[PDB]
Amino acid sequence: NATRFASVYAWNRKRISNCVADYSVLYNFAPFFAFKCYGVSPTKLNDL
């Protein structure tokens, strides 16, 4: 929920650590429509 994302060439990098992630709230708070993942399935992301 940023005010605005960066440009494609000055692409904005940010590391996430020392914290618990839930991708369920990541989508459920805010509707969206593009999604594709390699090396993992969108469900199994929740526990590895």
Partner 1 sequence: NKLDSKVGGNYNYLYRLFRKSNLKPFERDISTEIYQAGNKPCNGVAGFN
Binding residue for ligand NAG, selected from 8, 10, 19, 30, defined by CB under 6 A: 30
Among partner 1, ligand NAG, none, residue 30 binds (CB under 5-8 Å by kind): ligand NAG
What's the CA gap between 9 and 40, in Å, rounded?
A: 27
Q: Measure the CA angle with vertex 7, ends 14 and 39; round to 5°.
A: 50
> Quick check: 41 binds partner 1 (CB under 8 A)?
yes
Residue 41 is which amino acid?
Answer: S
Contacts with ligand NAG by CB under 6 A lie at 1, 29-30
Positions touching partner 1 (CB under 8 A) are 24, 27-28, 35, 41-43
